[PDB]
Amino acid sequence: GAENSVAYSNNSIAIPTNFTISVTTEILPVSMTKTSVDCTMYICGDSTECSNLLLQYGSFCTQLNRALTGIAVEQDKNTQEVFAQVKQIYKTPPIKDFGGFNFSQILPDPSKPSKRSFIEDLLFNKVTLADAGFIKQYGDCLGDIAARDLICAQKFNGLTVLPPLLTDEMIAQYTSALLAGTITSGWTFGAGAALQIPFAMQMAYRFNGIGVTQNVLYENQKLIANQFNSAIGKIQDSLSSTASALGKLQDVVNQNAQALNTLVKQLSSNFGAISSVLNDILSRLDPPEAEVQIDRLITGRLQSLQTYVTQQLIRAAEIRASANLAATKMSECVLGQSKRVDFCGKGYHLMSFPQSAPHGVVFLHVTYVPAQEKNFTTAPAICHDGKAHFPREGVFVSNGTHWFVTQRNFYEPQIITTDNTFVSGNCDVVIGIVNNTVYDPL
Amino acid sequence: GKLQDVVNQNAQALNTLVKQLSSNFGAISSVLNDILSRLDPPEAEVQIDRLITGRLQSLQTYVTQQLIRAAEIRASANLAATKMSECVLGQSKRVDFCGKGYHLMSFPQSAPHGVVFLHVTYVPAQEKNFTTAPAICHDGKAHFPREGVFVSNGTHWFVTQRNFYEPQIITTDNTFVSGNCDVVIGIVNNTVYDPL
Amino acid sequence: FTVEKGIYQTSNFRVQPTESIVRFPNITNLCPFGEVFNATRFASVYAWNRKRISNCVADYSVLYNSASFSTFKCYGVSPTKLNDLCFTNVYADSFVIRGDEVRQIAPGQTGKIADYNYKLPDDFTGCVIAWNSNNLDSKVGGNYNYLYRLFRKSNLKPFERDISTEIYQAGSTPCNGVEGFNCYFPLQSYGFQPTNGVGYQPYRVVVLSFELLHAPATVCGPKKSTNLVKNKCVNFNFNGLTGTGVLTESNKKFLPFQQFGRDIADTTDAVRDPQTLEILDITPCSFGGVSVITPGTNTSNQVAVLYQDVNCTTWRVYSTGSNVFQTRAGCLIGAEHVNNSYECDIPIGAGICASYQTSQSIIAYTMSLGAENSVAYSNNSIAIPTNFTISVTTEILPVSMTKTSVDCTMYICGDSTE
Amino acid sequence: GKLQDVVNQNAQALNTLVKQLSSNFGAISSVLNDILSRLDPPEAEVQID
Numbered sequence A: 001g002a003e004n005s006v007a008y009s010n011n012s013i014a015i016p017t018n019f020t021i022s023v024t025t026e027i028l029p030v031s032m033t034k035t036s037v038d039c040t041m042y043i044c045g046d047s048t049e050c051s052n053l054l055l056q057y058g059s060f061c062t063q064l065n066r067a068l069t070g071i072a073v074e075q076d077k078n079t080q081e082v083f084a085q086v087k088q089i090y091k092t093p094p095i096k097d098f099g100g101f102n103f104s105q106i107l108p109d110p111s112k113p114s115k116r117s118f119i120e121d122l123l124f125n126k127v128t129l130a131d132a133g134f135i136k137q138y139g140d141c142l143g144d145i146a147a148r149d150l151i152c153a154q155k156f157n158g159l160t161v162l163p164p165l166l167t168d169e170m171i172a173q174y175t176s177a178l179l180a181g182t183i184t185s186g187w188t189f190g191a192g193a194a195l196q197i198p199f200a201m202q203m204a205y206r207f208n209g210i211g212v213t214q215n216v217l218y219e220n221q222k223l224i225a226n227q228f229n230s231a232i233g234k235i236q237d238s239l240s241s242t243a244s245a246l247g248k249l250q251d252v253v254n255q256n257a258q259a260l261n262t263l264v265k266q267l268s269s270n271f272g273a274i275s276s277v278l279n280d281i282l283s284r285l286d287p288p289e290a291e292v293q294i295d296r297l298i299t300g301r302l303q304s305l306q307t308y309v310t311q312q313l314i315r316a317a318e319i320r321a322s323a324n325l326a327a328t329k330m331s332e333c334v335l336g337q338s339k340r341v342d343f344c345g346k347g348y349h350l351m352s353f354p355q356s357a358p359h360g361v362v363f364l365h366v367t368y369v370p371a372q373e374k375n376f377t378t379a380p381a382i383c384h385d386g387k388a389h390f391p392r393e394g395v396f397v398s399n400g401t402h403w404f405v406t407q408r409n410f411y412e413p414q415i416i417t418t419d420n421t422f423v424s425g426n427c428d429v430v431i432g433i434v435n436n437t438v439y440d441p442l
Numbered sequence B: 001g002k003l004q005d006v007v008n009q010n011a012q013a014l015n016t017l018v019k020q021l022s023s024n025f026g027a028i029s030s031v032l033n034d035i036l037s038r039l040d041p042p043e044a045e046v047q048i049d050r051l052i053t054g055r056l057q058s059l060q061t062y063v064t065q066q067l068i069r070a071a072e073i074r075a076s077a078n079l080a081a082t083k084m085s086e087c088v089l090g091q092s093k094r095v096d097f098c099g100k101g102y103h104l105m106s107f108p109q110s111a112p113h114g115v116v117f118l119h120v121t122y123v124p125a126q127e128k129n130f131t132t133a134p135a136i137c138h139d140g141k142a143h144f145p146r147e148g149v150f151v152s153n154g155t156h157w158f159v160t161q162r163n164f165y166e167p168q169i170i171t172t173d174n175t176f177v178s179g180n181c182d183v184v185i186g187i188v189n190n191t192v193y194d195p196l
Numbered sequence C: 001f002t003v004e005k006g007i008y009q010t011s012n013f014r015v016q017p018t019e020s021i022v023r024f025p026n027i028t029n030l031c032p033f034g035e036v037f038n039a040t041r042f043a044s045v046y047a048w049n050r051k052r053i054s055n056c057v058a059d060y061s062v063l064y065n066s067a068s069f070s071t072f073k074c075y076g077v078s079p080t081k082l083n084d085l086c087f088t089n090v091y092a093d094s095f096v097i098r099g100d101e102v103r104q105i106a107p108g109q110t111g112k113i114a115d116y117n118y119k120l121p122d123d124f125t126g127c128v129i130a131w132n133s134n135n136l137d138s139k140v141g142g143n144y145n146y147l148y149r150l151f152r153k154s155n156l157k158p159f160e161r162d163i164s165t166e167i168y169q170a171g172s173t174p175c176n177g178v179e180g181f182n183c184y185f186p187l188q189s190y191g192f193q194p195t196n197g198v199g200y201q202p203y204r205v206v207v208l209s210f211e212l213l214h215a216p217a218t219v220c221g222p223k224k225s226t227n228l229v230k231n232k233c234v235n236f237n238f239n240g241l242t243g244t245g246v247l248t249e250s251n252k253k254f255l256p257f258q259q260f261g262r263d264i265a266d267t268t269d270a271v272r273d274p275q276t277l278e279i280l281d282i283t284p285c286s287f288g289g290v291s292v293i294t295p296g297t298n299t300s301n302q303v304a305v306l307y308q309d310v311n312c313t314t315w316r317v318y319s320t321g322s323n324v325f326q327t328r329a330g331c332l333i334g335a336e337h338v339n340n341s342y343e344c345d346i347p348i349g350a351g352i353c354a355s356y357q358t359s360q361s362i363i364a365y366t367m368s369l370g371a372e373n374s375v376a377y378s379n380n381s382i383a384i385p386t387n388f389t390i391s392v393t394t395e396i397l398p399v400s401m402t403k404t405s406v407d408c409t410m411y412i413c414g415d416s417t418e
Numbered sequence D: 001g002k003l004q005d006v007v008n009q010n011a012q013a014l015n016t017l018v019k020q021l022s023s024n025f026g027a028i029s030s031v032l033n034d035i036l037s038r039l040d041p042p043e044a045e046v047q048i049d
């Protein structure tokens, strides 16, 4: 990183005079492809004798089907925990009078057949799935034999992919409900009932939550709305530019596809047998020896399945941890406001917006970042009549001739008064106290 | 059920493991005694090495599954410890971490292979529609609430705490002045009482 | 005997074959067993003969009426499958050896024959046939026309022939191709006599070398060809390669030397029909997944079946019946479609859930996401609570799981010292 | 110790892995060279697989 130094001193403080509203994108996996394996078709494809030999392994199989079923269930639980945290479906009002804040690029547009936002459409257009549909009829792979499609080769070997319980439309509807709740009711819909509030005023609260007096927002409301709209436009331009931004989600798709393709390739292995092809053994050897070679192939292919399932269980644990993190963020950033540093983006967190994505969630984190800082000379306290006056909430600064007190995160100098400071003890103990005067209102 | 499943899973794994003893793994028989009682060592040893390999693989599978479940339980236990620390020992501002609502306090209870938290939360029950304004102009000055909102019942303006309707008269000790009324959008006219 | 409420993933859908089809090259010639097994003169083992056998039918049933083999041994393939098989090329290696040397005609063997006159590959596919010839290859005064090599500088390679007759230098001194001390002739002969002991009697050995299931066949078994049936799951046999599958037309331009195609997993993709030089694709019949949706067996014995990747808007289903409808998860049979949404009970997938309602039947429906409502948002209206409730919720978390310990010896080798 | 155990565990795993080379796994010998030096390929290959 770049090397720099900070001008530290015992009587100098840097205070921001301006700020920027930034929007960051955090991408998290939530689910991964649900799989199901028919041990008989994979190991003993269309062979009754092999299946009959295989039946004494019924337990190794049923424990593999249980593990994969458990994974598929946990993928649906993960999705439900991330997106289904609101009991009711909220809808936006017909009038978008949000104080100048433009949400048209994140709220659903009713004119498309699936009520997704434009940014969500971009997300679906950057990550490319493998199945592209959960129906693949026998005639559709019967006539594509000229074509080496991977899905057909999987399905002929007992390897299938189950559809998710929650479709992209249902997830989009949940994210729409979450946006309408956060925008029209702030955090109140998370705790209990959705309590309507003007958007600008909730932003006044969000500013108070980060130590910035609400009058700053109202005075700069036009600037804040313009910075937000520009940040959203920049997010749109970024997602529209490249594709690797969502690599974290694409890798999940790729890993699952790779595992299945790898599994299919393992069928070419002999595992010590004279041939990997069951039919060549059966067509050349009589049962007493075909059975010796075949038990070996059954063992090898069962080990391959065991390896696959183990890898899927480990990845499922990885996805679950990511999904739990995503649910935590949904709860503590979208439904509330986070004081946890860098949990919901860099800066002082204001609010977040969920967007759905294939096998994942994208959070748009709106944060307050100090933009232009200044060097002021400061003091921890001022002596007046021998009394030591301290700020209740803020710091003392001087422009070189006059002492003022101001809010910590935004330069807003105030005259030193008895209603801003408090007295405790006297000036002769505290180190670095300076002399000034404190005005007493009539 | 979430706790019962753990018990069931462990019982199932052991029962499954026992059932695997009936498998031949390619051997002429799963029973060591039938091999030894029928075959002389040079061939009993060939069949037996095969059974040893198969049963060792079964154990390897069991242990791997237990390690994965143990990671699952550890993650749950770490979450439980986090809740114990930040809900029972303290008070949580983290939304929906310790139940739905605004968290007040929590109580631990033990359970077989687990912990049960009773989360006591504050939930708003009866809401009302008030007309509001971000600020009020008085003598040209813009007055803002320090902690709360401005509401009106239609004839009089009051200021009240955010999570519970408790209307107060607008005074100089409840609001603060910054700038003037001509910049802030939605400001309304009223009066601010100055205590003697 | 009890199945809990839910959806279970069961065995895929499976078509059974309807008929078997046997296809072989349209050759009617019989293999020249008489010219091999009944020959006036066999070659010597040092100069063994190699006859090519092609374009014929190998029955070997004819041999039963006259020949009686002392040994028969197939490496590679089983002796009972040879009728159900055909070969890519066949070579018959024919020679006479001494009886005690028959054991040496095998992979892995050593001796004056295995090393000096007839070595086999350790990757040998084929059959070793031997029988005694004491009443043909031996005379009174003995038969000295059968020669073997006794001295060689090194062992042979498999199927290597070394007919040379140069003088073998046993000693340190060159011999300039003359007979003398430490300079022996490498060729020696057998004295086969009708009064000689069994191990010193002549044996006639024929080695049949053949590469199976990998190239065009010309030497086929007595199996009947059948007519060809397309687009049906059948049990096929193409040049000895057996299997189950659907045979369809293909566009794979095989080269004249290619007989079979394969996938990466090494299974057969296509074959060239030996009767009509066309290429047929082999697509396994069984395909797709079947899920079973059921209330517990203590409630009802009615089930619904979801057929994944079939369409229903000659179906590949076990039973149509009534109540058949297409979902994006597959074709669901046995569940009545109800327009009303409910909370999900038995998940089906793709937004579809099922439940057992009331007269009683299984229903399928699109799941509800929660009640739909709207918020009265405006720029000057706020909702503020006037009352509150204290609620208590229960959150249950696992902390530990049963501690286990396994004695590998008792589990694997229970009460067995060995 | 919490950090030392990580180092120890990784070292232990590798050392354990090396020790597994002494196992026969049902073969006549764990040493590839002793099989190859005593058995011809058709049987050395059965033991070696």
Ligand SMILES: *[C@@H]1O[C@H](CO)[C@@H](O[C@@H]2O[C@H](CO)[C@@H](O)[C@H](O)[C@H]2NC(C)=O)[C@H](O)[C@H]1NC(C)=O
Residues within 6 Å of the ligand: A017, A018, A019, A020, A223, A226, A227
């Ligand atoms: C704080 O920064 C913003 C921009 O970061 C300033 O707004 C810009 O002001 C210049 C000069 O008036 C304009 O030309 C730009 O178009 C403004 N940008 C936007 C987005 O409005 C703002 O004036 C700064 N405030 C202070 C007090 O320095």
Ligand SMILES: *[C@@H]1O[C@H](CO)[C@@H](O[C@@H]2O[C@H](CO)[C@@H](O)[C@H](O)[C@H]2NC(C)=O)[C@H](O)[C@H]1NC(C)=O
Residues within 6 Å of the ligand: A096, A102, A103, A104, A105
């Ligand atoms: C919000 O921003 C958009 C551009 O990001 C403004 O323009 C609209 O864009 C959408 C989609 O690109 C179009 O369907 C609309 O017709 C556009 N509107 C106009 C007037 O051109 C949009 O106007 C902004 N919203 C507001 C309230 O100004």
Ligand SMILES: *[C@@H]1O[C@H](CO)[C@@H](O[C@@H]2O[C@H](CO)[C@@H](O)[C@H](O)[C@H]2NC(C)=O)[C@H](O)[C@H]1NC(C)=O
Residues within 6 Å of the ligand: A383, A434, A435
């Ligand atoms: C701040 O003001 C106090 C009071 O005027 C100063 O204290 C005086 O210091 C001088 C010199 O050190 C003494 O002679 C006086 O007797 C002190 N008066 C009292 C009341 O203590 C103090 O020095 C001033 N400090 C600064 C930094 O200006």
Ligand SMILES: *[C@@H]1O[C@H](CO)[C@@H](O[C@@H]2O[C@H](CO)[C@@H](O)[C@H](O)[C@H]2NC(C)=O)[C@H](O)[C@H]1NC(C)=O
Residues within 6 Å of the ligand: B137, B188, B189
């Ligand atoms: C709030 O009160 C101020 C002051 O009485 C109003 O400002 C006056 O508006 C009228 C008409 O717009 C002007 O003719 C006066 O000159 C204004 N006076 C001053 C001092 O600015 C303001 O319009 C009132 N607003 C509302 C909503 O009642």
Ligand SMILES: *[C@@H]1O[C@H](CO)[C@@H](O[C@@H]2O[C@H](CO)[C@@H](O)[C@H](O)[C@H]2NC(C)=O)[C@H](O)[C@H]1NC(C)=O
Residues within 6 Å of the ligand: C153, C154, C155, C156, C157
């Ligand atoms: C194949 O021929 C080569 C060449 O004649 C043989 O190798 C020779 O073996 C003699 C043995 O005394 C050596 O003295 C020569 O130096 C070798 N020459 C070379 C080029 O290797 C080889 O042994 C023959 N192989 C067989 C199986 O007979």
Ligand SMILES: *[C@@H]1O[C@H](CO)[C@@H](O[C@@H]2O[C@H](CO)[C@@H](O)[C@H](O)[C@H]2NC(C)=O)[C@H](O)[C@H]1NC(C)=O
Residues within 6 Å of the ligand: C386, C387, C388, C389
């Ligand atoms: C707030 O709600 C509680 C109950 O949710 C109200 O208490 C009930 O009041 C009625 C009428 O007086 C009694 O009949 C019930 O027995 C009370 N319930 C309990 C648990 O005490 C309470 O009066 C409400 N307060 C307001 C201001 O509306």
Ligand SMILES: CCCCC/C=C\C/C=C/CCCCCCCC(=O)O
Residues within 6 Å of the ligand: C031, C032, C033, C034, C036, C053, C058, C060, C063, C064, C069, C072, C082, C087, C090, C092, C127, C129, C208, C210, C219
């Ligand atoms: C003359 C060319 C023959 C080529 C045949 C090639 C491959 C098929 C082999 C068929 C059997 C060889 C004869 C042995 C029959 C068994 C006789 C018996 O056990 O009683």
Ligand SMILES: *[C@@H]1O[C@H](CO)[C@@H](O)[C@H](O)[C@H]1NC(C)=O
Residues within 6 Å of the ligand: A007, A373, A374, A375
């Ligand atoms: C504050 O002072 C230091 C050194 O005196 C200087 O490097 C720094 O740039 C100053 N800050 C600003 C905002 O100019």
Ligand SMILES: *[C@@H]1O[C@H](CO)[C@@H](O)[C@H](O)[C@H]1NC(C)=O
Residues within 6 Å of the ligand: A399, A400, A401, A402
């Ligand atoms: C400090 O601020 C006061 C208040 O406006 C001003 O009068 C004074 O000139 C300023 N001094 C400097 C050095 O900026």
Ligand SMILES: *[C@@H]1O[C@H](CO)[C@@H](O)[C@H](O)[C@H]1NC(C)=O
Residues within 6 Å of the ligand: A010, A011, A431, A432
């Ligand atoms: C602050 O630092 C300067 C220089 O290091 C020193 O001269 C001055 O006395 C210090 N003041 C205090 C209050 O420490």
Ligand SMILES: *[C@@H]1O[C@H](CO)[C@@H](O)[C@H](O)[C@H]1NC(C)=O
Residues within 6 Å of the ligand: B127, B128, B129, C376
């Ligand atoms: C608030 O007003 C809206 C529409 O004006 C109404 O639907 C809602 O019920 C009102 N709130 C209450 C608590 O009555």
Ligand SMILES: *[C@@H]1O[C@H](CO)[C@@H](O)[C@H](O)[C@H]1NC(C)=O
Residues within 6 Å of the ligand: B153, B154, B155, B156
């Ligand atoms: C608003 O509250 C005041 C204070 O009690 C009351 O005098 C007035 O009548 C109320 N108006 C309405 C419309 O409720």
Ligand SMILES: *[C@@H]1O[C@H](CO)[C@@H](O)[C@H](O)[C@H]1NC(C)=O
Residues within 6 Å of the ligand: A095, A097, B185, B186, C379, C380
């Ligand atoms: C509030 O909204 C109403 C209707 O949309 C409009 O007439 C009124 O002028 C708006 N007021 C402000 C301050 O935006």
Ligand SMILES: *[C@@H]1O[C@H](CO)[C@@H](O)[C@H](O)[C@H]1NC(C)=O
Residues within 6 Å of the ligand: C033, C034, C038, C062, C063, C066
């Ligand atoms: C082999 O010879 C015997 C007797 O000469 C004869 O009966 C038999 O048919 C012959 N075999 C064949 C295949 O011609």
Ligand SMILES: *[C@@H]1O[C@H](CO)[C@@H](O)[C@H](O)[C@H]1NC(C)=O
Residues within 6 Å of the ligand: C026, C275, C276
């Ligand atoms: C018989 O063989 C010839 C090849 O010479 C082939 O054309 C013909 O189709 C075969 N018979 C049948 C019934 O296929």
Ligand SMILES: *[C@@H]1O[C@H](CO)[C@@H](O)[C@H](O)[C@H]1NC(C)=O
Residues within 6 Å of the ligand: C296, C298, C299
């Ligand atoms: C099944 O239903 C019967 C009622 O006929 C009930 O007694 C039994 O406990 C139930 N068992 C399960 C596992 O649901």
